[PDB]
Design a protein around this ligand. Structure first.
Ligand SMILES: CC(=O)N[C@@H]1[C@@H](O[C@@H]2O[C@@H](C)[C@@H](O)[C@@H](O)[C@@H]2O)[C@H](O[C@@H]2O[C@H](CO)[C@H](O)[C@H](O[C@]3(C(=O)O)C[C@H](O)[C@@H](NC(C)=O)[C@H]([C@H](O)[C@H](O)CO)O3)[C@H]2O)[C@@H](CO)O[C@H]1O
Lengths: 136, 135
């Protein structure tokens, strides 16, 4: 069962060249969060903190800006923001992690699963709507 | 793509994040599956150009290098005594589409799990695309 700590978060769907596509901090706030080939950089490392354990909700912070939190951006993409109790449900399904809002109305997915793609917040897509979360 | 020895794995990882590589089941006439990439000879395949004008290739396990992957009953691939069984290997912007010679069906995975049989049929988003790497 997931515990609080530092993680990489990558998609079940590889890039066309076979690279694991890891959730990537874009270096500043209010800017879409993307995926890029797994490379061990700090931009790919995220702090998961348990918010409401009874609802399975978590805050997600970049290791490089550990006080900020991933929130829900305009145009339905995640962006990093000053803290304000922005939380996500992290459900381990038989198909991997479903990353959803608190109310489980939307899921994070990738439209094409390519290097540099923005993460989409919306309908639960087969395969690209599932994630792998591994401890650093 | 040049002739030689390759691993062939799906774009869709297993639920735990493992690359799922085309795996020889150890004998002929039996469904070919995927399993986590592990470097075993059962995951190594010989690609030989057949008709470079139609982009077709034969695919043979290294553990029985004269046998060829053919189209099994129930729409799964199986390894067979040779008979010019060929597959079109088209590199798309989404990776390799592995199709019959007539380009009517594609190989894909239904759930993308360890030990799953490869399906021959409709082209599925993501699991119908493959990565082919020299080994
Ligand atoms: C624990 C708690 O209640 N936290 C509050 C936040 O909600 C938690 O985090 C979000 C990401 C979801 O997972 C929630 O289910 C969860 O409880 C809350 O964040 C706001 O949550 C609301 C829903 O309750 C909504 O998702 C907000 O996202 C949007 C929106 O869809 O309305 C997304 C838009 O891009 C954004 N547009 C802007 C900022 O221009 C809008 C916009 O803020 C509102 O429409 C106008 O107010 O929000 C999400 O931000 C947080 C702020 O409300 O409060 C926490 O207490």
């Amino acid at each position: 069962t997931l515990s609080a700590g530092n993680y990489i978060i990558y998609n079940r769907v590889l890039s066309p060249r076979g690279e694991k596509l890891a959730l990537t901090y874009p270096g500043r706030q209010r800017t879409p969060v993307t995926v890029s080939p797994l490379d061990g950089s700090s931009e790919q490392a995220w702090i998961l903190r348990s918010y409401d354990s009874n609802s399975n909700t978590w805050t997600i912070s970049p290791v490089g800006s550990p006080n900020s939190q991933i929130g829900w951006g305009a145009g339905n993409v995640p962006v990093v923001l000053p803290p304000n109790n922005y939380v996500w449900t992290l459900t381990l399904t038989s198909g991997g992690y479903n990353i959803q809002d608190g109310k489980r109305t939307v899921s994070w997915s990738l439209n094409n699963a390519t290097a540099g793609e923005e993460v989409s917040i919306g309908a639960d897509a087969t395969f690209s709507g599932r994630w792998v979360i591994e401890k650093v």
